[PDB]
Design a binder for this molecule. Structure first.
Ligand SMILES: C[C@@H](O)[C@H](N)C(=O)O
Length: 344
């Protein structure tokens, strides 16, 4: 079924036109973005959108983010746009920021999982914008993965999940940030962070004041998702353990745990910076930015190699690290080992 369009070098418009044609015809198109790859459909066409949920096997109440290329499009999808929304748009769009607002009647309820609110974003990616421009349609698009697998950050990840199952994949290379957009709820004062992501909280806080963090960012079970990445948490075949604390103590803890799970005859994977004696070891990088960029790539490598346990080194809950920790903590099922410097 699928047509793959390599655009990772030059961005020929006639190629993007192929994909834009598929969006118009109510078909599915996977496309790169600065955050992760998205599985897009015409957000105006309710049955096209249904096909996203079906392809992914995604719960109907996990809503979808609508991608736009101009600000006049936000006016069509939302009503009651507050001023703090305009400030954030002006400063951070196009960018890894998603706003939740009151929806207008033009947004089908299948996008919003039944709710009166809609999640909108203007992606900072030439390919994603050009597709939206040439489709002349707003594009509904969660992450382009089978529900339960990790998010995709390259067209390889998309293809291993959906090649032959969806109409089109646009390959624009590995995504630069690597974790999903940040989501702010501007449906109430004060605003509330629903999902930490590509735009760090400190940045947002320079523009609008301090904001509330929704308890979902820290694990708490939510039964209604106002935004994606809040309620579901299949995002694995392996036990995942996160080790947090001072570096030298974490690395020592991981060492004991590799031995322990090998003693139980199990295949051990480790993600982090230390040198370890494991079956599989992915080096994620020195900085938090590099970590976010390689996170999902790493987790997909661990699922491919069929390791029984994944041991991850924590990172500082700061900059991109709030997000990388949030996604790790949602994958391991918050199985965290905290090691401390002793005070006696
Ligand atoms: C696909 C990508 O745009 C994703 N929905 C995000 O918000 O990061």
């Amino acid at each position: 079924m699928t047509i793959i369009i390599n655009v990772r070098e030059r961005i020929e418009e006639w190629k993007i036109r192929i994909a834009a044609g598929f969006i118009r015809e109510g078909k599915l198109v996977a496309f790169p973005t600065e955050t992760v790859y998205g599985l897009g459909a015409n957000a105006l066409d309710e049955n096209a959108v249904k096909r996203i949920f079906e392809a992914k096997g995604r719960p109907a109440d996990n809503p979808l983010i609508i991608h736009i290329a101009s600000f006049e499009q936000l006016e069509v999808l939302a009503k009651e746009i507050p001023e703090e929304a305009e400030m954030l748009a002006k400063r951070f769009w196009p960018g890894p920021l998603t706003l939740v607002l009151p929806k207008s009647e033009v947004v089908p309820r299948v996008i919003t999982g039944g709710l009166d609110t809609v999640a909108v974003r203007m992606p900072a990616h030439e390919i994603a914008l050009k597709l939206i421009e040439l489709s002349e349609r707003p594009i509904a698009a969660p992450s382009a993965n089978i529900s339960g697998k990790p998010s995709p950050t390259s067209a390889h990840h998309v293809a291993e999940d959906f090649y032959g199952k969806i109409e089109c994949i646009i390959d624009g290379g590995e995504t630069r940030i690597g974790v999903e957009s940040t989501v702010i709820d501007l449906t109430e004062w004060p605003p509330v962070l629903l999902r930490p992501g590509g735009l760090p909280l400190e940045e947002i806080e320079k523009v609008i004041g301090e904001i509330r963090i929704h308890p979902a960012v820290y694990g708490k079970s939510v039964d209604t998702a106002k935004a994606p990445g809040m309620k579901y948490r299949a995002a694995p075949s392996a036990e995942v353990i996160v080790v947090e604390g001072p570096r030298d103590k974490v690395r020592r803890k991981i060492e004991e745990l590799i031995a322990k799970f090998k003693e139980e005859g199990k295949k051990v994977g480790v993600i982090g910076s230390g040198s370890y004696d494991a079956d599989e070891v992915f080096y994620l990088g020195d900085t938090v930015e590099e970590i976010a960029r390689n996170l999902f790539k790493a987790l997909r490598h661990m699922d491919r190699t069929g390791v029984d346990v994944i041991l991850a080194e924590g990172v500082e809950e700061k900059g991109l690290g709030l997000a990388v920790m949030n996604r790790l903590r949602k994958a391991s099922g918050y199985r965290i080992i905290k090691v401390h410097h002793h005070h006696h």
